């Protein structure tokens, strides 16, 4: 439940677990991503 | 006036002996075909729903066959409570209704709701309807 | 109750306001009937033609807003869709 | 005619559970 | 399906029953046939939704939270045919089978979801008397953790070493597929759900009893959880009596001015007053016959 | 009137009716989990035993239940009918009462806790759905685990508010297991999965049916199964012989733990949800009032924890509604009472007579009461309902007279 | 009926007691009472 | 007047009604033109032509 | 197409009175766009690879 991570952010930055942000039936993760920021 | 229909009763002597006998011989023929019975006028009213299930644990019983039951049968109109047991073998459920309604009413309601349900239930157990009767329909016991 | 309970429980100029008005109206009696029932007709004719528009219509307290689109959108960019609408309201 | 600005980013303050980033071992 | 107006609702329902009773084995595999509630297209009364802002919850569990402790304690009130859940997502076991992984270790799609569907029941074998007691033969077998995903055995060499699920595919939790989205107020979209009342019953009967049964959850719901209403119709309903009650105390000072202000003896007015509660109590108790509604046109003349 | 009618009620008062049958029901209860052969051989003992008192002539006993929907008793509970000798063969100085004291005092075993009822009555009983306390808790949730410590919670603060109190969370407990865990890891060597190794379970250690031999009209079943000596204990179980896929050999105890242990008897379930009850209540005593201080007691000293909640309900369930019912009818009667008074008189003062001197046929008709020694009852309150209309028939011929 | 000699009879005498005694001190003290009662209103009617 | 003016987004045609109106309206099963034309058959292909 | 492509459901965990969907998937981006199906990798009964 737990996973080993190789780069991409550093100690300490919170983020939230959750890929429930999205919807499971095809929401194209790049493009539900996207929405996020502007 | 309560005098008036004593006045014109005391007249047609004749009538009201003959609706006394209209009377006396429509009594007499209710008095017997008017059903008869030691049995203590009923008691409440609710739907059975027992399904039978060999050798299952009591939480086996419940997942299986009780729960998908008493759940879809949340939704039927008329349902007061509901009455959910799984004991080790079989299903006992009770749809209990507001006192008073029609029982096939409440009979012929709790099987739509029974019909979506039986697809849901396990390999081969059935859902078996409650008989037309209460608890006192016990008239006869005998034994071979 | 009327007479059980009004016993046990102007007037004049205002009579007098419609009185001579039927001295007025008693004058040529069959024909100010004619044309008062010619009123009628004459004044409903023309007040008939006026507006005539739907039916009945209830208000409530708080509104429903129904807002429709092409369809084959996204459960997606409907969502979002969704949103954006929500927080201009 | 209403010049109104929202903000079109998605926006979420009603659900969201969040974690912080940790070191340690697997 | 559509009757001839005026037929009784019950009898339409228990009419459909037997002609969609031969229709359920012709059925695709798994697809039930759901019955439309005891409610009609007013019966929706109350709308609300969960929120927390704390941060220690999320959609995930919010909609599980209606459905498994708020559903069942509104469902259970006297004369609400159907809570329906509204825009939330559904927690899903979602098993993502990796192409190349299948290739590798030679098993097939088709393998894994039989191998699958194979693995994820319980068990009962009989009873056993020892001890002149009953002994009941309990068998485990329902899935629980997530290990018990990746150990679904798949393929098993004549050495003893086994290729399991996780060896083919990884096992992420996520949502569901939905049907339709909830937002609240622009700054979140959160999941709730709508109480529907049994067709000919008692709006703001059931409207008060819903509420006075939440102000016993604010007590019960977890930390953070709190449920922000979004549709009240006892507003409207107590707005449009308090209106009609206030004519009604128009019209009685009316008459009591105007009959009490030709004829100067005044105690004449208060006795021709009692003619209007009369004229609408004989009036109630016929409409009761008929148990028709009481709305607000009924209440017009 | 009021000086012999007020030490006149204050004399006994106990429950309502009681119909008394020519045959009686026996119904001894026992502990749970108890198996079909000793709670059927607890049956004989018991229908021996019921047969040795001369007054009875039949005994057609009874454990578990019948194929029906409306029986539904388990091994552990026996109903049993009997009937007695005619009324003119009894002994010389012997009553139902003597019968049914000799017969309480012959027929009993350990465990085996009597109890004795009319037929038709219990079977009404049966059936019935409800709660006996005159006030009741339902502690329902999503998990078992967590009610039932509500309710054990919940007696403790029971016992500390006027009125006597019971837990449930025992009463719904004596179940026994034999667990067959098995172990996907284990059964995954072999290549077997979890649902290839219940089949051992299902069908080789359970009676398992399968099929169903067509004869004319008749139908019995066909059921698969190992011999019985592979399967008498816990440890048979644990070398229960596998024939696995791979033509291995091997035990059960090699793809699963099997652990014997206690558990549920029988899942009692109300709304769709795991509800565990609480039957609290007083002997005689007030109703109106205890609920209440019970609704503010618990949410206040036993905090719920998330994902639960609490019904209360008992006898007072129609009970306050007809009593507070009966509060607006008897003024209906009353004012409809007056109405045919003054329908024959129509002085009003005379009327009067008739509404306040009717206690005499009251106060009078208890005094026998406590002679013959009868009891309190809505049959009694019947008599008394056509006895004031007795009594109101002698006052108006009287007054118009 | 009051003597419960029969079947059924346990509740075919709990409904006529309050008729036996209570009718025995009805009426022999309601022509006391009556009379008793339609006196003092000739002192409030005169 | 004012939220038609502010909530408005592109292909999005606004429109605002009662709600126990708008639900009734719903679950309405019927055609609103007060003359309506069905034509029914085997494949849609010569019908939608029709 | 059902299982791997759709997000097609084939069981349920049963979790006391609640009960969740379990369903077998590729990989999102194995099915982003057309293309991307005419190159889905299949595993054929002869353990052949194909597209
Ligand atoms: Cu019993
Ligand atoms: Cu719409």
Same mark, same amino acid.
């Given at each position: ?38 | ?144 | ?89 | ?26 | ?301 | ?29 026992? !502990? ?142 004596? &179940? ?28 080789? +250690? ?111 369930? !129609? ?28 002085? +009003? ?12 046929? !009251?106060? &009078? ?37 | ?46």
């Amino acid at each position: 439940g737990v996973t080993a991570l190789r780069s991409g952010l550093a100690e300490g930055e919170k983020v939230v677990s959750s890929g429930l942000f999205l919807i499971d039936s095809e929401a194209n993760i790049s493009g539900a991503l996207e929405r996020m920021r502007s | 006036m309560i005098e008036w229909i004593i006045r014109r009763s005391v007249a047609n002597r004749f009538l009201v002996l003959m609706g006394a006998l209209f009377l006396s011989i429509w009594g007499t023929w209710t008095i017997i075909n008017t059903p008869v019975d030691a049995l203590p006028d009923l008691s409440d009213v609710q739907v059975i729903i027992k399904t039978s299930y060999p050798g299952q644990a009591p939480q086996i019983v419940e997942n299986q066959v009780t729960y998908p039951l008493t759940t879809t049968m949340l939704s039927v109109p008329g349902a007061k409570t509901v009455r959910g047991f799984s004991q080790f073998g079989d299903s006992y459920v009770y749809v209990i209704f507001e006192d008073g309604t029609d029982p096939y009413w409440a009979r012929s309601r709790v099987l739509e709701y029974l019909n979506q349900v039986q697809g849901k239930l396990p390999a081969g157990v059935s859902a078996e309807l409650g008989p037309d009767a209460t608890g006192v329909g016990w008239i006869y016991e005998y034994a071979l | 109750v009327i007479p059980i309970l009004m016993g046990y429980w102007l007037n004049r100029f205002l009579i007098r306001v419609y009185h001579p008005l039927l001295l007025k109206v008693l004058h040529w009696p069959k024909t100010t009937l004619l044309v008062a029932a010619l009123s009628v007709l004459t004044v409903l004719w023309p007040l008939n033609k006026v507006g005539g528009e739907f039916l009945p219509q209830i208000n409530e307290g708080d509104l429903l807003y129904m807002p429709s689109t092409l369809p084959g959108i996204s459960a997606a960019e409907a969502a979002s869709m969704l949103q954006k609408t929500d927080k201009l309201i | 005619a209403s010049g109104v600005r929202i903000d079109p980013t998605q926006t979420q303050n009603l659900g969201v559970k969040t974690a912080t980033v940790t070191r340690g071992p697997l | 399906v559509i009757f001839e107006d005026g037929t009784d609702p019950y009898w339409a329902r228990s009419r459909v029953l037997e002609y969609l009773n031969q229709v359920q084995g012709k059925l695709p595999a798994g697809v039930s046939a759901e019955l439309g509630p005891d409610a009609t297209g007013v019966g929706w009364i109350y709308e609300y939704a969960l929120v927390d802002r704390s941060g220690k919850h999320d959609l995930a569990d919010l909609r599980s939270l209606q459905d498994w402790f708020l559903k069942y304690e509104l469902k259970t009130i006297p004369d609400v045919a159907e809570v329906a859940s509204v825009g939330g997502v559904v927690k899903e076991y979602q098993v993502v089978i990796d192409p190349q992984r299948l290739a590798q270790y030679g098993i097939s799609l088709a393998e894994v979801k039989s191998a699958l569907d194979a693995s994820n029941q319980e068990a009962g074998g009989s009873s056993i008397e020892l001890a002149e007691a009953e002994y009941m033969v309990r068998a485990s077998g329902y899935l629980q953790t997530l290990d018990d995903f990746n150990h679904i055995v798949l393929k098993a060499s004549e050495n003893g070493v086994p290729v399991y699920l996780r060896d083919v595919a990884k096992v992420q939790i996520g949502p569901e597929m939905r049907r339709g989205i909830a937002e609240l107020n622009g700054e979140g979209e959160v999941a709730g759900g709508v109480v529907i009342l049994r067709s000919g019953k008692n709006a703001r009967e059931v409207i008060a009893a819903v509420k006075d049964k939440l102000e016993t959850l604010k007590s019960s719901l977890p930390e953070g959880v709190e449920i922000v209403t979004t549709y009240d119709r006892s507003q409207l309903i107590d707005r449009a009596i308090d209106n009609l009650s206030g004519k009604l105390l128009e019209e009685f000072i009316v008459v009591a001015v105007v009959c009490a202000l030709f004829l100067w003896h005044v105690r004449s007015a208060l006795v021709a007053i009692i003619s209007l509660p009369l004229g609408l109590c004989i009036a109630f108790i016929v409409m009761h016959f008929q148990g028709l509604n009481a709305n607000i046109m009924s209440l017009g003349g | 009137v009021l000086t012999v009618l007020w030490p006149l009620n204050k004399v006994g008062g106990e429950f309502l009716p009681q119909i008394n049958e020519g045959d009686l029901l026996y119904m001894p209860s026992t !502990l749970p989990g108890i198996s079909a052969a000793e709670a059927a051989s607890m049956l004989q003992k018991t229908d021996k035993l019921i047969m040795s008192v001369p007054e009875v002539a039949r005994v057609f006993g009874k454990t578990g239940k019948a194929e029906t929907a409306t029986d539904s008793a388990p091994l552990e509970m026996v109903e049993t009918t009997i009937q007695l000798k005619p009324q003119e063969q009894w002994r010389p100085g012997m009553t139902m009462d003597k019968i049914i004291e000799e017969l309480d005092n012959t027929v009993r075993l350990p465990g085996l806790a009597n109890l004795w009822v009319p037929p038709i009555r219990n079977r009404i009983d049966m059936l019935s759905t409800g709660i006996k306390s005159p006030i009741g808790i339902k502690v329902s949730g999503t998990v078992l685990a967590d009610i039932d410590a509500m309710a054990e919670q919940i007696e403790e603060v029971a016992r500390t508010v006027p009125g006597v109190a019971s837990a449930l969370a025992f009463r719904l407990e004596g &179940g026994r297991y034999i667990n067959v865990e098995i172990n996907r890891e284990k059964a995954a060597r072999y290549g077997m999965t979890v649902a290839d190794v219940q089949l051992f379970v299902t069908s080789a +250690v359970g009676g398992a049916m399968v099929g169903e031999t067509v004869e004319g009209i008749a139908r019995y079943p066909i059921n698969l199964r190992y011999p019985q000596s592979w399967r008498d204990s816990p440890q048979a179980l644990r070398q229960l012989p596998i024939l696995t896929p791979m033509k291995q050999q091997i035990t059960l105890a090699d793809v699963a733990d099997i652990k014997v242990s206690t558990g549920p008897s029988m899942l009692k379930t109300e709304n769709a949800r795991p509800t565990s009850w609480i039957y609290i209540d007083a002997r005689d005593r007030d109703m109106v009032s205890v609920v209440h201080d019970l609704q503010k007691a618990i949410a206040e000293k036993v905090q719920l924890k998330p994902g639960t909640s609490v019904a209360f309900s008992g006898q007072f369930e !129609l009970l306050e509604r007809a009593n507070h019912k009966l509060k607006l009818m008897v003024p209906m009667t009353l004012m409809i009472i007056f109405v045919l008074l003054y329908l024959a008189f129509r002085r +009003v003062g005379e009327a009067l007579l008739i509404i306040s001197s009717v206690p005499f046929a !009251l106060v &009078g008709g208890i005094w026998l009461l406590w002679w013959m020694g009868f009891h309190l009852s809505v049959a009694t309150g019947t008599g008394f309902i056509a006895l004031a209309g007795v009594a109101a028939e002698f006052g108006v011929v009287m007054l118009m007279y | 009926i009051l003597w419960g000699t029969g079947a059924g009879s346990e509740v075919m005498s709990r409904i006529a007691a309050p008729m036996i005694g209570g009718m025995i001190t009805a009426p022999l003290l309601s022509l006391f009472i009556i009379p008793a009662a339609y006196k003092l209103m000739w002192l409030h009617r005169h």
